[PDB]
Write a protein that binds this ligand. Structure first.
Ligand SMILES: CCN1C[C@H](C)n2c(c(O)c3c(=O)n(Cc4ccc(F)c(Cl)c4)nc(N4CCN(C)S4(=O)=O)c32)C1=O
Ligand SMILES: CCN1C[C@H](C)n2c(c(O)c3c(=O)n(Cc4ccc(F)c(Cl)c4)nc(N4CCN(C)S4(=O)=O)c32)C1=O
Ligand SMILES: [Mg+2]
Ligand SMILES: [Mg+2]
Ligand SMILES: [Mg+2]
Ligand SMILES: [Mg+2]
Ligand SMILES: [Mg+2]
Ligand SMILES: [Mg+2]
Ligand SMILES: [N+]
Ligand SMILES: [N+]
Ligand SMILES: [Zn+2]
Ligand SMILES: [Zn+2]
Lengths: 368, 184, 368, 184
DNA sequence: TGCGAAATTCCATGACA
DNA sequence: ATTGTCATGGAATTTCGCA
DNA sequence: TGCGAAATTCCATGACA
DNA sequence: ATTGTCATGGAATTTCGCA
């Protein structure tokens, strides 16, 4: 404060204040003669309040805040003091956008067998058809084979009725779903436990995690659309046709239809593949096991130049899910408890709850 | 001649009337010839209409080259014939009073009837709900003749529900005397 | 047809049918022995109907359709016939997504003078404040200087009342706006003509074209949000403060505030810049003219590897603006009349109307 | 001493009462000292409240270092003083009965009054709507003393509305005899 | 005529419904 | 008949203080 | 052992609220 | 306590028919 500034006036040297400039008194204030002009050097005990005033004009970041201060003042290391305040502005931290991208996505291993993992989801509401409004879509992870069920609501009870029909064929080890109300209810947990099926949930608000089924939703709607061109949207009676059509469509990268991956032989549908006509079923199932293990698997893409990756104990902010108008897009800062993998973390949220969360719904808190 | 395959032939038949369950009275039984895999469908009647509604569900999953049945009314109607023609399914009938399948299908149909009888006594009205588990049992039942269950033969894998407890399938002295006092 | 296929059976050579393979009759059908197995060669008069059947199973594209046909058939140049049909499937053309990116954006020259061009827009609805629901935002193109007006509705009459207040200061040559109802009404055209102001409209549903004002909307909301944290959303009384705060905030790339670009001198606001205290106003206005012409201008970015650029007479499809559920995302194909610039075109739309349209709301029609 | 600048000093004053126009009766006149730029605000009264509401609009665009006025009630109230203090504006009063500006401001205020009188006669009630054009006129009027209009001096550019037809500003024999029969 | 650190510039990221 | 923009904060680069 | 063209593979683009 | 995906159609590359 006035201590430091006194020593300075009487020509002594202080660390951080270059000796080559002449420091003087005028109007009761320590001034200095800088290339850019004459600036006031406020005492250290003033600086915080100044930075805050500059920042608060429009809640500006580093450079825009600095440019204001530099108009009137100079002191050693001004930006450090600017950055200090930015890291403490609750309003800036929870309102500003991130400017760092997530690390490159994971490409999880394709489940090894049909019925290892099911991905499920709702589509809807759709226009009413026969009094139905939603579609339950169930996709086998290994095969891509799909089941469709029309429902009146995205409810546990309708999910349960449909899965009882499906599981008549076979019971899966794991069912994967997002955290919609239908799948997180304890009624659904009980239904699953009763059958030895393990529920596995996506991190919240991150439908990429249910990518397998989400991607099939697109095809389902795309085919429904084409079929309904020029007609009223009577989709109910089309679900069976779509199911069959999609389960028997080739994936150009795979060179197989999901039916083929599931049964190792075409049923009596148009353009049925005849290549295994002379094999025994046993020989056929042997070739099938082989096809199933040699399927193309994509790999993790190159990181963007400005990606960030989570580190235990780092301050991070969860994205607000359905933010209201004129309200911050980010929650208050929280702490990375565990790094499950480079794209998934457990955080402690100031309440404090444990939350398993996608990196895509996080930003690193700025300025530490 | 080429080897036998799944979807080569489906064998269908009705079972009933049964005691009502959620207003259902019959079961449409479908068994794939080659694998012995069984699908079951509850119906309100053994009609062409009920058959069509039920098979529409199954044929949205796999379509057989041939359907084989006895000469039941539902299966011999011209409506059912139209339905099969639309789908490129050839229909096959056993001569009247002389039903024929294969050893495998005959044995499977026997189990189905016996397994139903066993679980209906004691709760003759709860069967609608039991259909899913009846099917898993049937399809995860080991075949003496082949070394494999229908599940294994249809999908080329082990099932996540092995029914390693092959059941008696017979009636206990409890179930015998209380089945004779059920329809009495 | 049977003509071509007869010559083939008796060992003669036909163009397109490689001579090294043995062609034979069986079950009343011309067959051939290919590495992949034995395929049927249908007569040319059959092929169209076959491709169509394959395609229609699930309205599949090139490879997935081909893979079906290849199961049973072979003939010369199958994909040409596949592609022929894809280009004629109305349902596929209007439902499928594009897989080609637009060419790189234009960075239009910054207007030379304040009041050359105004960019205007509505924000809202916001939560009611004092019975107001919208904000009219007017941004001067050269300076970025901004005016804010609260309104009850995004209406011509409210736009007119506000612009009458604004234009009291100065009249702009051009006002740029999107095609919202407030700005396209003839009442607004009359209001503009009366004052010698030329209206210039964005291509429809392309707010990038109003980028200048759109970007200021973000800052306006961002500052409003910060200021309202922990309080009810009483934004009405804040508009003046926000206006002033933003007009006096530095752009780090420019090193000027919009007020400075507008007047060449700070008014009596906090941290006012003092650098021209010793210049005369004349000297000041001379330095200002200089600053205004030497401002940083960004340039057009590198094209993506799979961009497309419009060519006169090309078939293209306009994006459907607010597509209903289960309805196609694209209009029927149309023809590029004129290429206004690499990112803007005039199209004739089958009705046929002339429409000036953004390349971003177009895809090139596939398969010609 | 440093040269004069825009926003160094704003000169304010009321004009009225006037004939009602959309329920307004007064005009708050603001003239920047250095440029001669004029802003006008319709008010319902010459009160501190009306002054504050009006200047709040102007000061959301530019803030003066000094406001100068005569000793009108509205300008000498402690409320108006609070308002100015909040904004770091120094208030300046001319001695009572001895109003002083500068040559430029005096001349500008003269034009304003004269230009208003000229356009009110014939339509004494339509003036509220005319304020925008009155201001453009005033601000695009060439200064004999400096070579430039206020617009040019405030913005450093030519205006898109040059008022190249410098008006008479005087009253025609029509306007004289029909202004004497207006308030009569 | 070169060092360590501060200052400035660069620029991907994201949001304007 | 028209056309993206620009605050933001780590990183990269340049400049500064001193010798 | 090399040519022109057909076939196949590659892969950015975009959409799953 | 978890994790993107994959149809699509021009372009790039490889293979094919023939010599
Ligand atoms: C209520 C439980 N829920 C949560 C949210 C509503 N959700 C969802 C669901 O099925 C969803 C989707 O299919 N898509 C479409 C989608 C978008 C991008 C993408 F990459 C992929 Cl693979 C799919 N978006 C969803 N989201 C709206 C925006 N975000 C909020 S979101 O969560 O991302 C979403 C749920 O069931
Ligand atoms: C009714 C007249 N209109 C047309 C549409 C509704 N619009 C609009 C308006 O002001 C808009 C926006 O500010 N933003 C925000 C925005 C989004 C992306 C972007 F890059 C930039 Cl620059 C801004 N989006 C709008 N759009 C919703 C989606 N599209 C339909 S859209 O047209 O792109 C939009 C109108 O006034
Ligand atoms: Mg969902
Ligand atoms: Mg979904
Ligand atoms: Mg029978
Ligand atoms: Mg708009
Ligand atoms: Mg907008
Ligand atoms: Mg007075
Ligand atoms: N994995
Ligand atoms: N331009
Ligand atoms: Zn802040
Ligand atoms: Zn199609």
């Amino acid at each position: 404060l006035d201590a430091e500034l006194d020593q300075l006036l009487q020509g002594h040297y202080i660390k951080g204040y270059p000796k080559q400039y002449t420091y003087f008194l005028e109007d009761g204030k320590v001034k200095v003669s800088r290339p850019e002009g004459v600036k006031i050097i406020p005492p250290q005990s003033d600086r915080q309040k100044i930075v805050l005033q500059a920042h608060n004009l429009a809640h500006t970041g580093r450079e825009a805040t600095l440019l204001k201060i530099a108009n009137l003042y100079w002191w050693p290391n001004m930006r450090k003091d600017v950055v200090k305040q930015l890291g403490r502005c609750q309003q800036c931290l929870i309102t500003n956008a991130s400017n760092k991208a997530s690390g490159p996505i994971l490409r999880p291993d394709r489940p090894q067998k049909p019925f290892d993992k099911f991905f499920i989801d709702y589509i809807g509401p759709l226009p009413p058809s026969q009094g139905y409004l939603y579609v339950l879509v169930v996709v086998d992870g290994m095969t891509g084979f799909t089941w469709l069920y029309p429902t009146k609501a995205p409810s546990t009870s309708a999910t349960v009725k449909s899965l009882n029909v499906l599981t008549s064929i076979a019971i899966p080890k794991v069912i994967h779903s997002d955290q919609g109300a239908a799948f997180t209810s304890s009624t659904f947990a009980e239904w699953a436990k009763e059958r030895g099926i393990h529920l596995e949930f996506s991190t919240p608000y991150h439908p990429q995690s249910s990518g397998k089924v989400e991607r099939k939703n697109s095809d389902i709607k795309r085919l429904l659309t084409k079929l309904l061109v020029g007609r009223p949207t009577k989709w109910y009676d089309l679900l069976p046709v779509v199911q069959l059509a999609l389960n028997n469509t080739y994936s150009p990268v795979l060179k197989y239809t999901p039916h083929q991956l599931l049964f190792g032989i075409d049923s009596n549908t148009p353009f049925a593949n005849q290549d295994t006509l002379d094999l025994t079923r046993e020989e056929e199932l042997s070739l099938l096991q082989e096809i199933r293990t040699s399927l193309y698997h994509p790999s993790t893409p190159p990181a963007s130049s400005r990606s960030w990756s989570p580190v235990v104990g780092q301050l991070v902010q969860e994205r607000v899910a359905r933010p209201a108008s004129l309200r911050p897009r980010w929650h208050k800062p929280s702490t990375v408890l565990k790094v499950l993998n480079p794209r998934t973390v457990v955080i402690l949220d100031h309440l404090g709850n444990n939350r398993t969360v996608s990196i895509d719904n996080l930003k690193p808190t700025s300025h530490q | 001649d080429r080897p036998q395959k799944p979807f080569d032939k489906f064998f269908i038949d009705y079972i009933g009337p049964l005691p009502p369950s959620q207003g259902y009275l019959y079961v449409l039984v479908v068994v794939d010839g080659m694998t012995g895999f069984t699908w079951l469908y509850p119906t309100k009647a053994p009609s062409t209409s009920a058959t069509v509604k039920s098979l529409n569900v199954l044929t949205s999953i796999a379509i057989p080259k041939v359907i084989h049945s006895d000469q039941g009314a539902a299966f011999t109607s011209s409506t059912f014939a139209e339905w099969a023609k639309e789908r490129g399914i050839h229909l096959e009938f056993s001569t009247p009073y002389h039903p024929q399948s294969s050893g495998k299908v005959e044995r499977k149909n026997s189990d189905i009837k016996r397994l139903l009888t066993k679980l209906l006594v004691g709760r003759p009205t709860k069967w609608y709900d039991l259909l899913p588990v009846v099917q898993l049992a049937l399809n995860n039942t080991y075949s003496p003749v082949l070394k494999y269950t229908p599940h294994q033969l249809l999908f080329g894998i082990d099932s996540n529900t092995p029914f390693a407890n092959q059941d008696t399938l017979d009636l206990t002295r409890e179930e015998e005397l209380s089945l004779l006092q059920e329809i009495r």
